[PDB]
Structure formats: C-alpha cells, structure tokens
Amino acid sequence: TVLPFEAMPRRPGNRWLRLLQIWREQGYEDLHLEVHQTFQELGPIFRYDLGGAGMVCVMLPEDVEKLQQVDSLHPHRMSLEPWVAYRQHRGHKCGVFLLNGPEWRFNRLRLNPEVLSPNAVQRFLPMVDAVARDFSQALKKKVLQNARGSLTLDVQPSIFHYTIEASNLALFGERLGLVGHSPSSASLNFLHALEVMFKSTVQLMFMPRSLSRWTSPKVWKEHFEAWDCIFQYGDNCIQKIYQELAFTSIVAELLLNAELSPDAIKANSMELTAGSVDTTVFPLLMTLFELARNPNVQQALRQESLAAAASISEHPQKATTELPLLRAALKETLRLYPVGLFLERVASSDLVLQNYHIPAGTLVRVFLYSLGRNPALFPRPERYNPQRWLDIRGSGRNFYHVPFGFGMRQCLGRRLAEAEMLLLLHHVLKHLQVETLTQEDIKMVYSFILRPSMFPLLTFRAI
C-alpha cells in the first residue's frame, strides 16, 4: 500500500526557472508562505523540484518521529558551503554545525557535557542572569528618566546586544560591554563582523561556489574578511583563556578536558558564537510583541514572575522550572514564529512518509511554520494562547514542539538560548509593561532564518 516516490504530489512551476528566479534575488523571502500555501493545496506532503534536485516538504509531527527513527549515528544535514569554504581557505577546522559523519559525532559527544548537561547549565545560567539584570535595569532606567514613565523605542538592537553579550560571556567568560552605553571599538568591530558574515551568508548560500565566485567576488571578500575578524577574536580569547588556566567559561572547560584539539575547540566556539546571531533575538521580540497584543497573557506572566521573583533571585536556575507559563509562552512564540524555518535531514536510509517511499539520500525538510499552524493540532492556530501547551496531551506530543530540532543533532545551544530568553523576559516583565500601537500581524521574511521584515517600535511602561 506504500505509494512510489515518483507518485508524490509535485509543487506546480518550472524547477529550472524557479532556481533562476532565486539567483535573480539572492533570497527566497516568502519561502515559508509559498510552502504553506502548497500544503493547503496538495496536502501534508509534496515534492518541491528546484534545479537539478529538490526537497520533500512535510509538516506533521508523525513525520518528524519517522525522521528521527532513521537518524543514523551521524544524522546528515547539508553543510553550509560558504562557511565550509572559509575554513578550507584559511586551514581552519569545521565545527559540529558544518561537520557530518564520524567527525561530527566525535566533536558532538565532547561538547554536550560542557554546553547542554545540567551541570553546564548550572554553571553559566547565573552568568546569563547577570547580563539579563543589566539589560532590564538599563531599560527600566530609561523608562523612568522619561517624563511619563513611558518609553517608545526600537528594542531590537538592545535585545540583540543582550543575546550576544550573554552568549559570549558563557562561551568565553568575557563581557563585551554591548549592554552598556559605550562599548569598546574592538567589541563593536567584532559585532559588525558577525552581522556582515550573516548578511554575506544569505547573499552566497543560494548558488554554487563555482558560480557565485564569478557573479560576486566582492561578496566572498566581505564574507571571508568578516570570518577573519571573528576567528581573530576567537584566537585571542582562547589563547588568553589558555594562558590563565595555568594561573570560568565553556571554552575553559573544553581546554581543560583536552579531548578536542585547540583548533577544534576554536572551530566549535566560533560556530557557537555564530549560533547566537539572528536567532535568540527574534523569539524574544515576537514574544514581547504578542504579549503587547494579548494583555491578559502578559498579566498572567507578570503574576507568575512576581510570585517567583524571590526564589529566582536566590537561585537564578529556578527561572527554568518555576516559570511554567513563561516556558509555554516561548513554545507558543516559536510555534507561530520558528527561528529555523525548517528542519533538514538527508535520509540516511529508506523510510516512509505519509505512505510514500522516500529513497535514501532524499532531502527531507520539515517546515515548522506549517507544522505549528495545523488546526487539527492547534485549534485556532492563529491565536496566541500559551495555555494550550499546559493542556496538550497527545501520545506523540513531544514532536509538536521541535523548533530546536530533534535527536542527537538537536541545537547544541538550546539550553543557553532558553536560559537567555526566560531570564530576560522574567526580569523585564517584573517591573515593566509592554505595549504596541499596531495590532495587526507583522510580516516575516525567510533570510537563512525566519525574522520580521521590520519589527515595529514598542512602548514600555512602569507599573
């Protein structure tokens, strides 16, 4: 009863013209919408032919489960060519984000204890809480410096600085000063290189290195120069940490472990640094936006955080356990606005998705934008209702929330990202109320990650 792979519904359109249409623009900003529309038309599975190959698109938790069942010991995710190109050119190692096969697993097993283990989280969470406190106090100060105790501003830069500040402190044990009003020029240079590296990544990742090296030599120059600044900052930090180990951070533990070479430690530390760029910031912004649009949800989160403020202050780690509604609020935000638009696996072995045979080597992509909007799973999917997550009780409900991926290749920074998001929202919601003038949905664009095209100004008010 299993249908052949070739009988799978195909998305209409010309696979070759569409690829040229992508190169015409160095982007595919409406990917989430165009895929979402196709699901509505053809069902929960279809093939998207693009150029010489394509992708099988799915959106159901049961498909995620079947994908994790055929996860080999080395789950295969396509490497990001422009990033790999820089490593080979300069002679750097590739980290877990870019690696595949045995070398990935070798690196992964020697990183999990220092990045994901409960002991690791116990270590750096008080560090993140400190940075979150600085942000909230600085913001609360600006609000009260105002005439009416109310401030309207663009919070994306400051929140983005927070995520970089907190992550860099956990990774290298150094404060960049980005939450302060006057950071050093070195810190600003580093931050600019990160932004340029991400920008140039989008410009290059949609065509082969063979071609893009002709059509855009200056983009590659910007990309490698940005990476040079990043790896230069990483070399300095790792060297400094190493010297001081002969007389507290994630890299220090990795150096003490001595399981990975200094080059491998650096490679993974740069991909962890890159991992906090244009990721954690956006769920934070979209949560604030939705809390401004749903005052009752915001007030419920404030009562929760105010009730647990004392214990959290004594033990910051309690923010990850004693704030269940805030955790649900993050699930609801990521349900509607997943950072990673899709999860990607190259089928290591044959499998069956939606009664269709999937040959080994097929590129399968789970589109979370469509997964989270399935009404049969999230009734009234357009509604921002964090309470739904305390009530879900399906047998396979652990696959309803996979914004960080699944299996052994799941986001290595998940615990760090969750800590950063929870601690910031907790400390902000304690003393401040967020409001928005516009109540309409804002547009998202797919540019490597899913982000708002133009996040609006928000108004903060003291209680």
By the 10 Å C-beta count (0-12 exposed, 13-18 middle, 19+ buried), 9 is classed as middle
Angle between helices 281-293 and 324-336 (to 10 degrees): 100
Q: Does residue 95 interact with ligand JD7 by CB under 6 A?
A: no
Choice from 75, 275, 283, 316 touching ligand JD7 (CB under 6 A): 275
Query: What residues does 49 pair with on adjacent strands?
Result: 54
Q: Does residue 331 interact with ligand HEM by CB under 6 A?
A: no
82 binds, among ligand HEM, ligand JD7, none (CB under 5 to 8 A by kind): none
Q: Does residue 68 interact with ligand HEM by CB under 6 A?
A: no
Stretch that binds ligand HEM, among 238-246, 304-312, 336-344, 385-393 (CB under 6 A): 336-344
**Contact string (CB under 6 A) for ligand JD7, positions 63-82, x = contact:** --------------x-----
Q: Please state, in angstroms and rounded to a whole number, the distance separating the CA atoms of residues 344 and 308.
A: 38
Stretch that binds ligand JD7, among 57-65, 129-137, 274-282, 287-295 (CB under 6 A): 274-282
Query: What residues does 446 pair with on adjacent strands?
Result: 450
Residues 6 or more apart in contact with residue 105 via CB below 8 angstroms: 73, 74, 408
Closer CB to ligand HEM, 28 or 124, in the complex: 124
Least Å distance between CB 411 and ligand JD7?
6
Site for ligand JD7 in 287-346 (CB under 6 A): 340, 343-344
Query: What residues does 363 pair with on adjacent strands?
Result: 346
Residue with tokens 């299996």: 407
Stretch that binds ligand JD7, among 168-176, 188-196, 246-254, 271-279 (CB under 6 A): 271-279
**Contact string (CB under 6 A) for ligand HEM, positions 174-213, x = contact:** ----------------------------------------
237 is in an annotated binding site: no
Q: Does residue 279 interact with ligand JD7 by CB under 6 A?
A: yes
Closer CB to ligand JD7, 226 or 308, in the complex: 226
152 binds, among ligand HEM, ligand JD7, none (CB under 5 to 8 A by kind): none
H helix runs in 91-184, sequence order: 102-109, 112-115, 118-145, 156-172
Least Å distance between CB 245 and ligand JD7?
27
Query: What residues does 343 pair with on adjacent strands?
Result: 366
For the chain, what's the residue count? 463
Give the closest residue to 111 by CA, choosing from 343, 413, 406, 345: 413
Task: For the chain, give the residues followed by a break (C–N over 2.5 Å).
Answer: 247
Q: Please state, in angstroms and rounded to a whole number, the distance separating the CA atoms of residues 125 and 179.
A: 17
**To the nearest 5 percent, what fractions of the chain are helix, strand and coil?**
55, 10, 35
Q: Does residue 166 interact with ligand HEM by CB under 6 A?
A: no
Query: What residues does 10 pair with on adjacent strands?
Result: 47
293 binds, among ligand HEM, ligand JD7, none (CB under 5 to 8 A by kind): none
Closer CB to ligand HEM, 8 or 267, in the complex: 267
Least Å distance between CB 147 and ligand HEM?
36
Q: Does residue 297 interact with ligand HEM by CB under 6 A?
A: no
Q: Please state, in angstroms and rounded to a whole number, the distance separating the CA atoms of residues 6 and 107.
A: 37
Choice from 97, 231, 356, 399 touching ligand HEM (CB under 6 A): 97
Cβ(47)–Cβ(11) under 8 Å? yes
Sheet containing 342-346: give its strands across.
45-50, 53-58, 363-367, 342-346
Cβ(160)–Cβ(281) under 8 Å? yes
Closer CB to ligand HEM, 108 or 431, in the complex: 108
Q: Give the other-Cβ count within 10 Å of 392's Cβ.
A: 14
> Given the rule CB under 6 A, which residues bind ligand HEM?
77, 96-97, 108, 167, 271-272, 275-276, 279-280, 283, 339-340, 343, 403-406, 409-413, 416-417
> Given the rule CB under 6 A, which residues bind ligand JD7?
77, 274-275, 279, 340, 343-344, 411, 448-449
Residues making up the annotated binding site for heme are 411
